[PDB]
Every structure is written in structure tokens, then in C-alpha cells.
Specification:
2 copies of one chain form a homodimer.
Chain A (H helix, E strand, L loop, with lengths): L1 E5 L9 H13 L11 H9 L5 H11 E7 L7 E8 L1 E5 L8 E4 L6 E3 L14 E5 L2 E3 L4 H7 L5 E5 L2 H10 L1 E5 L5 E9 L7 H7 L10 H10 L4 H6 L5 E6 L19 E4 L9 E7 L5 E11 L8 E8 L1 H9 L2 E10 L7
Parallel strand pairs in A: 3-16, 4-10, 13-15
Antiparallel strand pairs in A: 1-2, 2-17, 3-17, 4-9, 5-9, 6-7, 7-8, 10-11, 11-12, 13-16, 14-15, 14-17
């Protein structure tokens, strides 16, 4: 990927609504770049800037920053904008006859093995176990936690084991309670067993074809095969544990551990685009509505290779999920950069 | 590397005394080989041969077994025959002003990590640690144990920390008490830190040249540099714990859990030479005198990496140790093998 300087007048205009929202989402991450190489003084400048003055935003941007078009190879500046979202699942604080699937916090008999300093070849492996006598042995796999429960507090109860599996894959989500209040859940720990996507088990068993395996297809197969749902979820021996964040309307936290804003946060390649960077996005919704806005690189998703890419966070819930799933849009991306500073490799 | 079938008449001759002692050493493994797919049947046959009848032994071998020259690397059949022994060191059952170095059994808080069913790539490693909160930390390294001790049973007290290091390298030893009586020590466990020969440290410090590194030269350097012994020995972060046996005449036990015979037991590469196998050995003693004999694979040595290699157990005591330390001899090794049975792959 290459950076190609662009005049402020070459970028597409944005409405005042989008300029401010995208500025507010981007400055939202300033509290965590107070001592960042490149963004601290921009932020300090921005901290002074109002957020209800478009003229004052444009001043700050065009005065303090440069713009660079993101180009890859062959398609050049024309890239691909996909989408992602935070799911919301029906559930309860308490077991009922409809909500029987427990979501567990971290067990305190779960021991994290931490021997990387003696054996570097262990980094990235998530080794965990239970200590019985003088031996650290494998922790309970997923199948065993589904049958017998966990030695851990229950943070919430879901209505469908398939909702638990998806929640454990994504690492965060909200639980909708009956009184409309919501529970914030995020990754905390893992049983130490290697992940094995249930999709792959559906291919080997001869139930789907590698190209047919979507989320919507696994869900359809499960609903068609209620007897086999336990076998299916057992095939992934890995089991994820959660923490419950304070109740809040903020969006989930991403890799920058800043609450994502719906419509104004993106997942990028951290190399090509440093986390915290301000971007300019021109693309469309699946229905063709122009999407032209500043957006903040506040999360990670970058396997960039021969074509520009970013993932746009569209919010939480089923409709955000539907919007995010249909996102396959041609788009252009500019990275904004503080003027003096040299850009990154 | 490779097994090259050889005719019996290509093997060098052995005296009747050597043929008898080597048969006897090897036959003593048969008590541990009753469930061996390879050696069980030969052992049943062997049990009925008179160990006082050379002709019956040679008959049994030539009838029921084939001979396979071992070869590896550019030297092919020419290999390296080193030595080991059981050292005997003056010491005490109790701490005195002349015996202050403790020999430890297995600590109560030493946890063995046993996650290989989940990650088969761990299978070579001795992973160990101590549990601190919900974390398995590295256990204290050799240097920390030497300086501060360990929470473990004390088995004996030595006068010189170099003696402990040697004892930890050979894995077995005797401690001579003031009343002439002796106590047996054998390997029981280790702190999980990777071994690093102290010889390598002295070379890295330009104190010895890679060719002069012998046990004699290392001990000489330590004599001349008492103030640097603690840093010399902690350069090997591995620390070995022992078990005490009651004194007895028999040889120490190797990995096959069978008492080793001086001059007729070898430590081998366990994958190339399965424990319990009978071998033919042709080499010399350091003074050049011929050593031609059957020997038994009854211990585990360093794996074969481009050179054929075996460690010859020479017995216990200082004289055995001088012999074992001078052993650096060209050798030929044949593995014997029951007819019809597939070789190891």
C-alpha cells in the first residue's frame, strides 16, 4: 500500500452533521493518545476546538493536518468497505424456563500458564489448566461445560446455545433483559482448548460445502437439526469466559479500548493505518446512499493485501447486523496526518 | 539416521568373558520388557540360555537376531563413544560448618504442566512452574535456589556447590558419610528451566577455548575463581531434585529403571535405539586398549544429530569418573534386532 498526498480541495465534502459526529468520535480517542507520538498535540489542539462549530473543525483540520489517499495495487484508490456490528441477544439475569444457557465469568480454579520467558515458542499459545495435586491438567472443554456447568459465577442466562457460541466467537455483546435494560459482556478468559470453528465440522460431516458456510447457514442448519446442536457446539472444544462491564449506552470497546461509535469507527490494518488516526471515507450504503464522513480508526482488522480495505462499525443489534452483513461497497479512504510529522512506513 | 543390515561374520569378535557379561547385563532388562512388542519374545528365549556357556549364547544370537550397523551423517558408521558414571562425594546427613550445600528432594509447590494432549508439540519439553494466584509462574532458577534455598525435603549436605552441579549432571550419585556409610541419590524432578552447560558460559567469557573444555578444566577454573563460582553455576538455570534410596551394592537405575552395569550399559538415542535393545560395541578406552563387547541400551542419552553416539556407563567412584571423563572415542555400533520384526521408523 502507498500514500499519495491529496489537497484538501480534492477530498469530497462532508455535511456539518457528519463532520461533527466524525470529529467527536475521533476526539473521543484523545483521552488515550495524551502521550502518543503523533496525535497528542492534534488532540490538545482539538480539545480546545469546539465540537458544535463546523467552521472551527475545518480550520483545525486544514490548518493542522495533511491528507493522503490510500492506494493499493491494481485497483489503486478503489477499495472495499465491509461492515461489522455488536450483536444483542435475548436473556435474563436469572435462570428461567426460557433462559437456561449460562454465561460464565472467569473461574478461579483456572490457571493461566505463563512460561514464555523460558520458552518463547509459547507466545501466542493460550495455555491454561486446572491444578490437581501437583499437575496442571487440561481445563474442562466446551462440551463438558455445556453438560455439567462451570465452577464460576453466572453473569447472565441466554435462551439459545447458538447465541452463546456466537457471543464467544465475537468476544463481546449485549444481553437484552425483559424490562428492556441491557447487560454489557466482554471477553475475560478462555479454557485453554484450541479453537475449532463449528463451520469446519459441518463440512467434514458432509452437511455444508466450504463455500456455503456462512453464519446464516449454520444457524439455518441448527434450526433444521435440533437433535444435533449439542454435537455441533461440542466440536469447538474452546470455551470463552466473560466480564460484565458497567451498564452503559456506549458502544463496545475495540482494540484501542475506546467505545466504538456507530457509523464513525473503522477497523483497519494497524501497520498501514496507526490506531487512533483520523480518516476520510467516501462510500455508500448497500442501498446506494452516499456515505461521506470523517471516521476514526479505533479497532483492528487488517489483512491488507492488494486492495484497500476497512470495516465500518454500524452499531449494535439485529438491524445493524443486517446492514453490516450487506456492506460490500466500493470506497475511497484518505488518511489525515499531522503536518510536520513524517508518515509511517 | 539409518540402519544398514550387516552379516554376523562382519562383526568383530568378542572374548567369552565379554560375551557373557554383556549378555547378562542385557538379559537383566527382560523383567521390564515382558510387554515389549520387540524384545518380549527374545527375552523368553534368552531366559533358558546358560550364561556360563558362550557357545549357547552365540547360538541364540545368531539364530534369532540380525545385526544392523548404525550410521548417521558424513562419518556414517564411525561414531563418538563418551562416558558417564556415578560420582561419590563426601557429605553429611545434617548441615555442618564443613557441609553447607543442601541436596533437595521434589518441592511440594512444584507443578508439572501436562498440556500435551492439547498441544502435542510440547511433548519434548519439561514445563514446570509455581502457582501464584491464578498464574503458573516459572519456578525459581538454579541461581535463586542456590542463593536462597528451596521449600523441599533435604536429602543430604555437600561441601562444595560444584559437587552438586556434577551430581545434577550425571543424575545419580552416592554421598559418603563420616562413618563410611553411603546414601544413594537419583534424579526425581527438575525446576523446568532449560539446561545450559556451564562449559558454554566459560567459553562465552573467554575463560576457556572450546577444545579445552573438560570437566577437569572447569573444576580447575572454579578452584582458581572461588568468588565467581555462584555466577558460574547459575549460568545453568536448570536445577535437579533427587530422591534418596537406601544404600545397596547394585548399580544405579537408568531410564529403563534397571540397575546399570559398569562397562556394559549405554545411554542411547531412545528413538533410534529402543530401550532394552542389545547392541554390539567396538571402540577403545582412552589409553587405546580395545573395547569390543555386546552392551545393553538401558539409559537415555543425547539424541543423535548427524553423528552416531552413545554414552558408556563405567561404574561409580573417582576412578570410574576419570575413565568416563576421558572417554571421547571413535566407535562402531551395531543394533541387534529380532528377525522379521520391523525396525523403528
Amino acid at each position: 500500500a502507498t500514500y499519495a498526498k491529496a489537497a484538501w480541495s480534492a477530498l469530497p465534502p462532508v455535511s456539518d452533521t457528519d463532520l461533527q459526529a466524525g470529529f467527536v468520535a475521533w476526539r473521543s480517542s484523545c483521552t488515550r493518545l495524551k502521550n502518543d507520538a503523533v496525535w497528542a498535540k492534534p488532540c490538545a489542539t482539538a480539545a480546545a476546538v469546539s465540537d458544535k462549530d463546523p467552521a472551527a473543525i475545518r480550520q483545525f483540520l486544514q490548518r493542522d493536518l495533511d491528507a493522503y489517499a490510500l492506494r493499493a495495487g491494481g485497483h489503486q484508490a478503489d477499495g472495499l468497505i465491509t461492515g461489522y456490528y455488536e450483536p444483542i441477544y435475548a436473556g435474563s439475569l436469572t435462570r428461567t424456563a426460557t433462559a437456561t444457557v449460562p454465561v460464565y465469568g472467569t473461574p478461579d480454579d483456572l490457571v493461566v500458564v505463563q512460561l514464555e520467558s523460558l520458552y518463547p515458542e509459547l507466545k501466542g499459545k493460550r495455555l491454561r489448566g486446572r491444578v490437581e495435586g501437583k499437575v496442571l491438567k487440561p481445563y474442562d472443554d466446551a462440551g463438558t461445560i455445556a453438560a455439567k456447568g462451570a465452577n464460576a459465577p453466572v453473569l447472565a442466562w441466554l435462551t439459545d446455545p447458538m447465541d452463546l457460541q456466537l457471543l464467544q466467537i465475537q468476544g463481546s455483546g449485549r444481553v437484552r433483559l425483559a424490562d428492556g435494560k441491557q447487560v454489557r459482556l466482554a471477553y475475560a478468559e478462555q479454557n485453554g482448548h484450541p479453537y475449532r470453528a463449528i463451520g469446519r465440522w459441518l463440512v467434514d460431516q458432509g452437511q455444508l460445502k466450504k463455500e456455503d458456510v456462512t453464519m446464516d447457514a449454520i444457524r439455518a442448519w441448527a434450526r433444521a437439526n435440533p437433535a444435533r446442536v449439542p454435537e455441533l457446539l461440542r466440536s469447538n472444544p474452546s470455551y470463552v469466559f466473560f466480564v460484565r462491564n458497567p451498564d452503559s449506552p456506549e458502544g463496545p470497546r475495540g482494540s484501542l479500548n475506546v467505545p466504538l461509535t456507530a457509523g464513525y469507527s473503522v477497523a483497519v490494518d494497524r501497520s498501514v493505518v496507526p490506531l487512533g488516526s483520523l480518516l476520510w471515507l467516501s462510500t455508500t450504503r448497500p442501498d446506494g446512499t452516499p456515505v461521506v464522513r470523517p471516521v476514526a480508526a479505533q479497532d483492528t482488522g487488517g489483512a491488507i493485501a492488494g486492495e484497500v480495505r476497512a470495516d465500518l462499525y454500524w452499531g449494535s443489534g439485529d438491524a445493524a447486523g443486517k446492514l453490516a452483513g450487506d456492506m460490500k461497497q466500493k470506497g475511497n479512504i484518505w488518511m489525515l496526518w499531522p503536518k510536520g510529522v513524517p508518515l509511517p512506513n
